[PDB]
Amino acid sequence: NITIYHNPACGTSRNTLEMIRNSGTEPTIILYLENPPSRDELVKLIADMGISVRALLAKNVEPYEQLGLAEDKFTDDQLIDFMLQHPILINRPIVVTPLGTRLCRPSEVVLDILQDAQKGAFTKEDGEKVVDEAGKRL
Ligand SMILES: [Cs+]
Ligand SMILES: [Cs+]
Ligand SMILES: [Cs+]
Ligand SMILES: [Cs+]
Hints:
It contains four helices and six strands; from the N terminus they run E-H-E-H-H-H-E-E-E-E. The protein is of the alpha+beta class. A four-stranded mixed β-sheet has the order 2-1-3-4. A two-stranded antiparallel ribbon has the order 5-6. Strand 5 (about 120-125) and strand 6 (about 130) form a beta hairpin. The longest helix is centred in the first third of the chain and has 11 residues, at about 10-20. It is elongated, with a radius of gyration of 15 Å. Bound molecules: cesium ion (4 copies). The PDB classes it as oxidoreductase. The entry lists the keywords reductase, arsenite.
């Protein structure tokens, strides 16, 4: 049972999706930009990821810039509500499996929570080797 909050226009997200597939399961794919999680779901993801609310913020997207979010003037709940109102602020990809939830940045973070091993060598789309044929992380 795997879910990925995916942005097809982001290389890290594409790389993550293909690593998931290379472990042999096809995940549930949520285009968070158009189908963002609910407030309750979003709080849970953040808790399960073990990161701060602010570490989940995508920088260099228009709401981050225009809302002044780089400044330390926002509570965590304010930041969660901005994320819900402007889903492009949610950094990507988030992946949930039976073993846990991670913000998969860099994409190979996802190897921690995939239950089955990669089924063969995996190379990122830009040529960066991740795992060889033997299954060793390079
Ligand atoms: Cs939802
Ligand atoms: Cs693992
Ligand atoms: Cs292998
Ligand atoms: Cs890259």
